[PDB]
Amino acid sequence: KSWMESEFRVYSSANNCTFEYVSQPFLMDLEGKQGNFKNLREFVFKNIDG
Amino acid sequence: ASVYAWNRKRISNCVADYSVLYNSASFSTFKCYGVSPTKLNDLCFTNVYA
Amino acid sequence: EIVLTQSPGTLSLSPGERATLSCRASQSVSGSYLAWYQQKPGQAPSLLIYGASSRATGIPDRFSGSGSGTDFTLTISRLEPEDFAVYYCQQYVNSPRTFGQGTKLE
Ligand SMILES: *[C@@H]1O[C@H](CO)[C@@H](O)[C@H](O)[C@H]1NC(C)=O
Ligand SMILES: *[C@@H]1O[C@H](CO)[C@@H](O)[C@H](O)[C@H]1NC(C)=O
């Protein structure tokens, strides 16, 4: 019993690159519980004046 | 690194001790171009490439 | 006061080979404010170089500086008999334009 990320199919390669940021490592559950929803994550993204 | 394989590091998201390149003055050259060794050095930088 | 010490005091010994005349200073020469001089016996010194490596008018490029920091080089690529002369250094950094003690004196 262990839920771990195995696949990451997003991008192929990059030649130029300008901004990189990696947070400190942590641990996450990744297990799929059964029942009703229990978490709500709200985000707002804006882009003004650069 | 060797000159042909010039190694680049990106200095990102940290304040910088710009009071760190002549006080030792081990370096023969702290010859700065455009920015100069001044308060402008010890100021906001979008990206720092070493 | 920035003292200058020329290191080869009599390395020449009527030299028939390329030379490595040197000068060293207590505080590093800032911005290559150094010069070399050609003092032929019985005559006045003649400028040989300015900056670090910048050559002089009427002086062949066989005379070559190669200095930085503690500016220290005057290199005779192909040695000629007439060019023999005590060579002097002089620094325009802070010092009252002081000179070295001479490297090619008999
Ligand atoms: C135990 O689970 C991990 C996943 O975290 C997996 O990589 C490993 O192969 C498992 N052990 C065995 C013996 O299969
Ligand atoms: C990367 O930046 C350079 C610099 O202008 C540009 O010429 C090039 O097209 C950019 N992209 C790639 C994939 O090299």
Swiss-Prot record, chain B:
This is Spike protein S1. The chain holds residues 348 to 397 of 1273 of the full protein. Binds to host ACE2. RBD also interacts with the N-linked glycan on 'Asn-90' of ACE2. Cleavage of S generates a polybasic C-terminal sequence on S1 that binds to host Neuropilin-1 (NRP1) and Neuropilin-2 (NRP2) receptors. Interacts with host integrin alpha-5/beta-1 (ITGA5:ITGB1) and with ACE2 in complex with integrin alpha-5/beta-1 (ITGA5:ITGB1). May interact via cytoplasmic c-terminus with M protein. May interact (via N-terminus) with host bilirubin and biliverdin, thereby preventing antibody binding to the SARS-CoV-2 spike NTD via an allosteric mechanism. It comes from Severe acute respiratory syndrome coronavirus 2. Attaches the virion to the cell membrane by interacting with host receptor, initiating the infection. The major receptor is host ACE2. When S2/S2' has been cleaved, binding to the receptor triggers direct fusion at the cell membrane. When S2/S2' has not been cleaved, binding to the receptor results in internalization of the virus by endocytosis using host TFRC and GRM2 and leading to fusion of the virion membrane with the host endosomal membrane. Alternatively, may use NRP1/NRP2 and integrin as entry receptors. Changing T29A: In strain: Omicron/BA.2, Omicron/BA.2.12.1, Omicron/BA.4, Omicron/BA.5, Omicron/BQ.1.1, Omicron/XBB.1.5, Omicron/EG.5.1. The gene is S. Changing S28F: In strain: Omicron/BA.1, Omicron/BA.2, Omicron/BA.2.12.1, Omicron/BA.2.75, Omicron/BA.4, Omicron/BA.5, Omicron/BQ.1.1, Omicron/XBB.1.5, Omicron/EG.5.1.
